[PDB]
Every structure is written in C-alpha cells, then in structure tokens.
A paper describes a structure:
At the early stages of autophagy, selective autophagy receptors like p62 thereby bridge ubiquitinated cargo via conjugated Atg8 to the forming autophagosome.
In order to improve our detailed structural understanding of purified p62, we determined the cryo-electron microscopy (cryo-EM) structure of full-length p62. Therefore, we recorded a full cryo-EM data set at pH 6.0 revealing long and flexible filaments with a width of approximately 15 nm. Due to pitch heterogeneity between 130 and 160 Å, we refined a more homogeneous subset with a 150 Å pitch and 13.6 units per turn (corresponding to 11.0 Å helical rise and a −26.1° helical rotation), including dihedral symmetry and obtained a 3D reconstruction at 4.5 Å global resolution. Consistent with the class averages, the local resolution varied significantly from a well-defined PB1 domain scaffold at 4.2 Å resolution up to over 9 Å for the more flexible regions. At lower density thresholds, the ZZ domain envelope emerged connected to the PB1 domain, albeit at lower resolution. The densities of the associated C-terminal domains were weak and poorly resolved as they did not follow helical symmetry, presumably due to molecular flexibility with respect to the PB1 strands, which is in agreement with the assigned structurally disordered region in residues 169–33821. In contrast, our full-length p62 filament structure was solved at pH 6 in order to obtain a more homogeneous closed filament conformation following the helical symmetry.
Numbering used by the authors:
A (entry chain C), B (entry chain B), C (entry chain A), D (entry chain D), E (entry chain U), F (entry chain V), ...: 2 to 105
C-alpha cells in the first residue's frame, strides 16, 4: 500500500508555510518475525518521518492534523486514531496539516 | 450501535480550542455475564474516554456539554441524563463541548 | 403528563450560570393506595429533584422562580402556587430560574 | 540521460526575476570505480550547479522548488526527494523555482 | 386532546392573506359504538373544517401544508400522514398553510 | 431500521414542485417463511410507495434519483443499486428526487 | 480491487444525459481453475455491464471513452487499451463517457 | 524507448474524428539473431499498428502525417522519413494525423 503524504506546515493565520510531499508505508510492514515487540506504531513512524524532513521543526514539538468533512482541522496523535484519519484519503494523497506547539 | 463523538474543547469566549472526534459504543455492551455489578456507567465510560484522549485536561476536572434546540450548552454528568443528551444526535455524530473547571 | 423542566441557575446580574434540563412528572402519581398520607407535595418533589442534580447548591438553600407575562421573576415555594406557575408552560418546557439564598 | 534544467529565480510576489536554463546529468555518472565513497549526491550536484551559475545568490542560501499537479511550489532538498521531483519532467525540461532564505 | 389549528391562507409569493385560528379534536372521538364504519378520517375532518371557515375557498380545491425542520412547506392529504404532520406541534398550535389548486 | 424518505418532485429547471416526506422499511422484512419467492424487491417496494402518494404521477412513469458527493442527480432503478443509493443517508433522511418520463 | 465506474452517457453537444455509477472488479477474478479458456476479457466484461444497466442503449451499439490529460475523449474498445484507460483513475472512480453509434 | 503515439484521425475540414493513443517501440527491437532479413521497417510496423486499432480504416488506405514547426501536416511513408518525423516528439507523445485516401 504505497501512500503519499502531503505535509502542509501551517503558519500564522493557518496559511501554509512549507509543503513537503513524501511517501508512507502504513499497511506495509517489515519481515514476519519478531526482532522486537512490534516496531514503532504506524503513527509513531509517521511523526518520526515528518520530523525528519522539515528542518524548521524538531521532534516532539508539533501537532499533526487532518481535515474532516466539516472542514475542521482534527488533530491526531494516536495510532488507533491515525486509522480514522486515513479514511479521508482521496486518491492516494493523505494531506496532513502540521502546527507547532507554542506557549499556550 | 457505532456512535461517533466529536469532542469540542472550548476556550476563552466559548470558541473551540481542540477537536478530537473519537468513536463510542453506548448501547453495545460486553459479555452477557456478571464479572462485576454492572461495569461503569455509559456516562462514566464516556468521560473516562474523553479524559484519555485530550492531553490538555485531567480526569475529574472537566464538564461535558451538548447543544439543545435553543442553542444553549446544556451540561450533563449523569447517565440518566446522557440518554437525553443522545436524543440530539444528527447523523451519527454526537457533538459534545468540553469546558474545564476553574476557580469560580 | 411528561413535563420537561429547564432549570436555569442565575448568577450575579441575573445571568444564567448553569442550565440542567430534566424531566418531571407532576400530574402522574404512584400506585393508587396509601403507603403514606400522600407522598411529598408536587412542589416538594420538584425542589428535591432540582437540588439532586445541581452540585453547586444544597437543599433548602435556593429559591425557584418563573417568568410571568410581565417578565418578572415570580417566586414559588408552595404547591398551590406551583399550579399557578405551571400555567405558563409553553410547549412542554417549564422554565424555572434558581437563585441561591445569601446573607440579606 | 541528458536533462535540461530551467532554473527560475523567484522574486517578491513569486514572479520570476532571472531564468538560467542549464543542462544536468543525474542518471549519468563518472568512471565505474571508487575514487571516493560515492561522489556527491544527485541533489547535492544540482544545488552546487544552480549556485555556480546565478551571481545573485550564494551557496547554502537558497531553496529549490518544483510545481506538482496542484500548482504548489513543493520544495526539495534531499536526493531521495529529487527523484520524486524529476517524475514531473515534461519533455526534457525540469523546471525548478529558486527562492532565497531570508529572515523568517 | 384540545388542539388549536392556526390556518394560514397563502397568497401570491407565499405571503399570508388570511389567518383563521380554530380548534381541532383529532385524538378525541365520538361515542364508543359504531353508527358507521368509523366516521370520516382525522385528516378528512380537518380539511372539512378548514373549508367550512374560509369563505374564499371551496372544498376539494385547496392543499394544506405544514413546515418541517427545514422550513419547507410539506403537503399532507392522508390521515397516516397527518399523524406525521402533528409531531411538529409547538405548544398546542398546529400551524397549517393553505394553498389553492390553480391551473398547473 | 426506520428510514425516512423525503421525496422531492422536480419541475422544469430541476426546481422542486412538491415534497412528500414518508417513511420506509428497507432492512425490515415480513414473517420469516415463504408465502412467495421473496416479496417484491426493496427498490420495487420503494417505487410502488412513491407512486402511491403523489397524485401528480402514475406508476411506471417516473425516474427516482439521489445526489452523490459531486452534486449530480444519479438515477437508480435496481435494488442492487438502491443499496448504493442508501449509503448517502445523512441522519435518517433519504432524499430522493423524482423526475417524470416525457417524450425524449 | 474494488473499482467504482461512473458511466456518463453523453448527449447532443457532449452534455451528459444520464449518469449511472456502478462498481467493477477488473483485477479480481473467479476461481483459479479453467472452466473455459479464460472468461471474457476485462473490457468485454465492462461493456457487457454498461449495456446491462442503461435501458437507453443496446449492446454492441455504444462507444465508451475516457478523458486523458488533454481533456480529449479518448475511446477504448480493447482490453490492452482498457489497462491504459485505468491509469487515469483518480480516487477509485473510473469515469467513462458513453456515446452511441449513429449513422456516420 | 517507450514511445506513446496519439493517432488523430482527421475528418472533413481537418477536424479530428477519432483519437486512439497507443504505445510504440521504435528503437526497441527483438532478439539479436536473424530469423529473417530484418523484420518489417519501423514505419511499416507503425502503419501496421495504426491500421489494427482503428475499425474505420483498412490497411493500405490511409496517409499518416505529423505537424512540423510551421504547423503544416507533413506526410511520411518511409522509414528514413519516420526518423525525421520523430524528432518532433514533445514529452513522449508522438502525435500523428491520419487521413484516408479518397478519389483524387
């Protein structure tokens, strides 16, 4: 399941500041034997890869979102919630919206 | 009865600060034999799950609401009152409005 | 006679602080034999149920009101006066206005 | 694989200020023995050549982009991302869009 | 079940031309023995009474409506559909909207 | 599965001429023994009921539609296609759009 | 591979006259043993299903198209050409455009 | 060298009547040993494949063209002239223009 993720980085008034467009492999998985318990999570591997590409942000300091049917930026941080996020993929493009974690 | 709950977290002037959108299983219930008296309540399981998702709040310190026909944020804390709250579900989306418990 | 009571709790400048919206069963009554003299009163059962729902008030320390045709908050504490209060029900919603009993 | 790169240098309101049009040799490679580990990268050789031609910019201080199917200026800085950039070549012209790195 | 019917007679651009406000006795019924099969229908008695009051219309030549939650003038002509019309009564006022049957 | 069908009857420029709003029982079914092969179809029972309510149309001479995500009036006449029509129900309201079968 | 086909039927000035929206199973295939040579073709099964749904056309008398990147209605009739047609699927919707075979 | 050929079939006033868009393998060639003298020619294989796809024409009765820099439909029938035709390929699309051979 080759899945393209188009990571929007949002700015001041929720206008996009930098777009990245990488590829992601959620349903694919490594070798079918346990070298660990079971890897990282599918949302933990996503946020580890969004943090690796953008130079403008550091890992652990950003909140990834998506747009639902109402147009609202629904956040996601879990991997049982990333599966609800990915039911909104249009063609193969999973558009996420990155916002940084400021003061309050 | 798969039931989607869209938890709005309200801010200063009752504007939404963070939206979460999980799923909830009120009318479904576990195995039909008593390992306890009867579980937690259907409102106790709801507020235990709203507190588990949001990192910005801690359990026991938030008041969940809903909008009635007048547009007012009617609160609910009981499970005989959650059944009156859930007669306002539109499609399958049960929109609740979370407010934190401050000083006075 | 299923009758919905929307209990407004008034605040500083008679602005509503918490709304509750329960259901009430005035004209319905229990089994048609005397286990007591005749229960509590229909206003005594109302004020016992308004005190049970709100955590912010304690029983015996609040004055329930209603709005008449002039817009004035007419109080009621009797059960021969609750019958005059309930001649202002609009659809099935009996809006009462709760005020607490302070110093003077 | 002779590949023409048409380097647009963008200005104030993303209008082109200077166009350069050089040639690039991504899939071609030098002698088939290791005088080093493996050269520079195919994106490192591209940005070293865009910086060599334009007198108006200095190396390390510009962000190269491309247009995707949505019309958005998707940036690229990696060489596993330059391979996704180059799947948008039209005839043999790989149009990149240069933007300088200002204050914030 | 005393039920007030406020019959709006609509005009050119669906503006009310004459309002009548009578009373109606749907759930009440005559003597509990069959002098006929079972009377007229509860919608047949309604349209026979709307035609009796208005001098501007003649029976069989008008279409009675109601407003649903969307604001649309939903028509009704059956008595299994009048029961769905009467689930929109607000206090005890059942507002119907009369339109005459013209050419096409 | 109580399911409300709001039958729009379209006019000249696809503007609604008469709206009907009945109820429909697709997934419910009669007694669990065969008095026939298996009844009519779930789309055959729907179009038999839309034709029964509207006086302005006669059975066999109308095409029922629905709106998909693109806003287009997708027609349906089969009962393996009515199941795809009914995946667009919003709350419990299944809005169909009736058009009559004219010359060409 | 569940694949939705949205069959536009074109009219006089290539404006759509009737839209159908069925589902298609190209890459899925029946039991893995030969009851025949190898079924019909994947384009022969498509045109047999488009002809089965539309009442306005008869099989063998219509030309199915698709839109390429230029906006042109490229026809297809082969099954080595249907595989080039299906590289333009957007989400899972394979929009074909039906035109009938008239005089000349 | 995968090469896409978009075969326009021209009509009365040189307006396109049917477009076909197949793929062609000019510079690729079969096994590197002589089962014949040397196959057909690269223009003979092209015109044998254009005649195989279009049902509206028969082989030997059509003239394939291309557009040069002046906008003129330059014909080609040789395979030392097809190599001059294919120096006008834009991305990988080799647009030819088919005209049938009528009376005079």
């Amino acid at each position: 399941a080759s899945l393209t993720v188009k990571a929007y980085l949002l700015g001041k008034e929720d206008a996009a500041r930098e777009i990245r467009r990488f590829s992601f492999c959620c349903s694919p998985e490594p070798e079918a034997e346990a070298e660990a318990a079971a890897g990282p999570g599918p949302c933990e591997r996503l946020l580890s890869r969004v943090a690796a590409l953008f130079p403008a942000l550091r890992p652990g300091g950003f909140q990834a979102h998506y747009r639902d049917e109402d147009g609202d930026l629904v956040a996601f941080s879990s991997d049982e919630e990333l599966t609800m996020a990915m039911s909104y993929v249009k063609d193969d493009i999973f558009r996420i919206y990155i916002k940084e974690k400021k003061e309050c």
